Design an enzyme around this catalytic site. Structure first.
Site, mmCIF file in Angstrom:
data_model
loop_
_atom_site.group_PDB
_atom_site.id
_atom_site.type_symbol
_atom_site.label_atom_id
_atom_site.label_comp_id
_atom_site.label_asym_id
_atom_site.label_seq_id
_atom_site.Cartn_x
_atom_site.Cartn_y
_atom_site.Cartn_z
ATOM 1 N N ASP A 83 39.571 40.058 50.056
ATOM 2 C CA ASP A 83 40.725 39.331 49.493
ATOM 3 C C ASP A 83 41.115 38.212 50.461
ATOM 4 O OD1 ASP A 83 43.119 38.544 48.142
ATOM 5 O OD2 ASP A 83 44.219 40.289 48.889
ATOM 6 N N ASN B 275 43.929 35.988 49.531
ATOM 7 C CA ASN B 275 45.224 35.432 49.152
ATOM 8 C C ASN B 275 46.347 36.462 49.042
ATOM 9 O OD1 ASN B 275 44.489 36.508 46.651
ATOM 10 N ND2 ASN B 275 45.524 34.891 45.524
ATOM 11 N N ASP C 49 46.820 39.230 47.346
ATOM 12 C CA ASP C 49 47.184 39.926 46.134
ATOM 13 C C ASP C 49 46.552 41.323 46.039
ATOM 14 O OD1 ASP C 49 44.531 39.348 45.423
ATOM 15 O OD2 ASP C 49 45.080 38.364 43.539
ATOM 16 N N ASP D 35 38.040 38.424 46.026
ATOM 17 C CA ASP D 35 37.876 37.199 45.247
ATOM 18 C C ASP D 35 36.625 36.428 45.695
ATOM 19 O OD1 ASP D 35 39.019 35.717 47.646
ATOM 20 O OD2 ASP D 35 40.819 36.789 47.017
ATOM 21 N N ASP E 174 23.987 45.272 31.669
ATOM 22 C CA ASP E 174 24.818 46.483 31.577
ATOM 23 C C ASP E 174 24.472 47.254 30.273
ATOM 24 O OD1 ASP E 174 27.309 47.953 32.496
ATOM 25 O OD2 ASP E 174 28.019 47.373 30.443
ATOM 26 N N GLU F 58 20.105 47.989 33.133
ATOM 27 C CA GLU F 58 20.747 49.298 33.407
ATOM 28 C C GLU F 58 20.376 50.155 32.198
ATOM 29 O OE1 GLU F 58 24.795 50.137 32.504
ATOM 30 O OE2 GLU F 58 24.948 51.859 33.910
HETATM 31 CA CA CA Z 1 42.645 37.879 46.012
#
Ligand code: CA
Length: 554
Positions: free
Chosen positions: A20, A22, A24, A28, A198, A252
């Site tokens: 991460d 930022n 939150d 990301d 998937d 998969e």
């Molecule tokens: Ca983030």
């Protein structure tokens, strides 16, 4: 020459839980981009990222509401473009996840499809009348209750093998197939190097939707792989899409009988290039998917031997011991107690990196990350656990405590706790509050401490990866299990062009002996883990420490 992907080492990034940038609490694209040097230094050739598309996140990216836009939490299209450019600067390749068995119920196709019976999108999905006052048939959903959900607007049910908010796309409809192919070209035109499909074996649905038999009901995942048009659709996709590009494809193949796997991956059939199979990773899972059944190394190695055989001459397997849908490798196949965790994680690295196939290392396994110590059912995010609560606890089949004890061992959330970067707050994953709690063992298991230590799990993976890259037999050589019935010591050879290598891995937390096949002797020791001394040149046997692993030229 063999294609690049046969000798590549891949790394799987679950972006939500990687890094991460930022505050939150969600990982990301900028976080992944900032950590590319970490992956390049480990020796990774290619990264497979879990879905990165616009999503309401009822199933963390696997419910996609627009296939041509990036997920808001991960960043913008510019961020994705920047990731691609930085991978390319480092000579690295990107594989993306392709989720086209189903979309989000927020996808504009589905909003339109559900609105009436006579609209151009009605047959993008499966809409059916109920039978005898109830659902169209007895199909169960992987995520709880029926696979059929009623919509009072039209009074018909739509099909969802997965969650209620993941309606299945109708591959029987030509216009839908054309839309999917155009969408794939959109990403391939950007230069992505690989695609992972998937639940690729569920695309074809059974005509008439008859009820499952009681037998089929207990193994419904298998019934869902038996659609009559499956290979026709995969061959069409190859002809209209993958023939025009140079991307590798991997399926998969969840729930299919092993003997049907060659249909997906025989290179002559022009379907997929490589297979993810689940025979091994689910080898000790009960049919209900939330209990564990004790197995031995003999079961483990016999499963590998069978999977290897089905690739044969023209097919190709991936090899993995962990992914975002399964418990942690060291906890599952090794021994994650404090005294054995590092030794058994190394032994498993040795296995992973010496199999015939393209190895995939799941994020954090190179640190020896473990299962998470869940205490209550509220510690789980995963929608599959909510579905087991619905199917088993609410119905009085099991108590909440029974569900907890058992799913703590099996849940996907074990693989999804934040990557442990260092021993700062939240293991350096985030400056905010992580979307899922960080394992408290991050004080002892973290990248910053591992990278600095030559004797660490990270260092061993790094060293094995160099050895594999330098030794052609260890990727594309033949595979032969020396003794499939042995439940203590796993030993096998890899050979190519007259060179043979021996891999020997003690799966017991006790000393064990190993005798080489009569006539075979050690020429050289490439690497060992948990060993006090290499064998002597010419040795006909080995004395193994608990959890010792090694690679020898023979
Ligand atoms: Ca983030």
């Amino acid at each position: 020459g063999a294609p690049w992907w046969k000798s590549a080492v891949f790394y799987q990034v679950y972006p939500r839980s990687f890094k991460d940038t930022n505050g939150d609490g969600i990982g990301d694209f900028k976080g992944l981009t900032e950590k590319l040097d970490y992956l390049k230094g480990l020796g990774i050739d290619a990264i497979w990222i879990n879905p990165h598309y616009a999503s309401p996140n009822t199933d963390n990216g696997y419910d996609i509401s627009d296939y041509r836009e990036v997920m808001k939490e991960y960043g913008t299209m510019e961020d994705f473009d920047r990731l691609m450019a930085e991978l390319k600067k480092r000579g690295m390749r990107l594989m993306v996840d392709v989720v086209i068995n189903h979309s989000s119920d927020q996808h504009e196709w589905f909003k339109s499809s559900r609105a009436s019976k006579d609209n151009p999108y009605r047959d993008y999905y499966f809409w059916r009348d109920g039978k005898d006052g109830h659902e169209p048939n007895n199909y169960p959903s992987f995520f709880g209750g029926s696979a059929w959900e009623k919509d009072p607007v039209t009074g018909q049910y739509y099909l969802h093998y997965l969650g209620r908010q993941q309606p299945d796309l109708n591959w029987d409809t030509p216009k839908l197939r054309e839309e999917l192919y155009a969408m794939l070209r959109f990403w391939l035109d950007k230069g992505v190097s690989g695609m992972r499909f998937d639940t690729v074996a569920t695309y074809s649905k059974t005509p008439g939707f008859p009820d499952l038999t009681p037998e089929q009901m207990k193994n419904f995942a298998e019934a869902y792989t038996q659609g009559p048009n499956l290979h026709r659709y995969l061959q069409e996709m190859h002809e209209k899409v993958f023939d025009h590009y140079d991307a590798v494809t991997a399926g998969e193949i969840f729930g299919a009988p092993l003997n049907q796997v060659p249909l997906f991956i025989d290179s002559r059939r022009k379907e997929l290039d490589m297979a993810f199979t689940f025979d091994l990773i689910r080898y000790d899972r009960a049919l209900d998917r939330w209990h564990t059944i004790p197995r031995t190394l003999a079961d483990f190695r016999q499963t590998i031997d069978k999977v290897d055989a089905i690739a044969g001459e023209y097919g190709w397997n991936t090899f993995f011991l962990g992914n975002h849908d399964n418990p942690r490798a060291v906890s599952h196949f090794g021994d994650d107690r404090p005294q054995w965790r590092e030794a058994s994680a190394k032994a498993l690295a040795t296995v992973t990196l010496t199999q015939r196939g393209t190895p995939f290392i799941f994020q954090g396994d190179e640190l020896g990350m473990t299962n998470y110590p869940f205490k209550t059912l509220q510690d789980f995010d995963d929608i599959e656990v909510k579905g087991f609560f619905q199917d088993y606890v609410e119905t009085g089949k099991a108590t909440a405590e029974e569900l907890l004890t058992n799913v703590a061992l099996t849940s996907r959330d074990n693989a999804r706790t934040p990557f442990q970067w260092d021993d700062s707050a939240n293991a350096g994953f985030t400056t905010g509050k992580p979307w899922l709690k960080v394992n408290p063992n991050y004080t002892e298991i973290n990248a910053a401490r591992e990278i600095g230590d030559p004797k660490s799990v990270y260092s061993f993976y790094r060293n094995l990866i160099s050895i594999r890259h330098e030794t052609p037999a260890l990727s594309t050589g033949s595979y032969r299990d020396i003794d499939p019935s042995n439940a203590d010591v796993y030993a096998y050879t890899r050979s190519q062009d007259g060179e043979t290598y021996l891999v020997v891995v003690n799966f017991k937390a006790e000393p064990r002996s190993f005798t080489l096949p009569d006539g075979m002797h050690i020429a050289e020791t490439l690497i060992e883990s948990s060993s006090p001394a290499a064998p002597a040149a010419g040795a006909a046997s080995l004395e193994l420490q608990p959890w010792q692993s090694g690679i020898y030229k023979v």
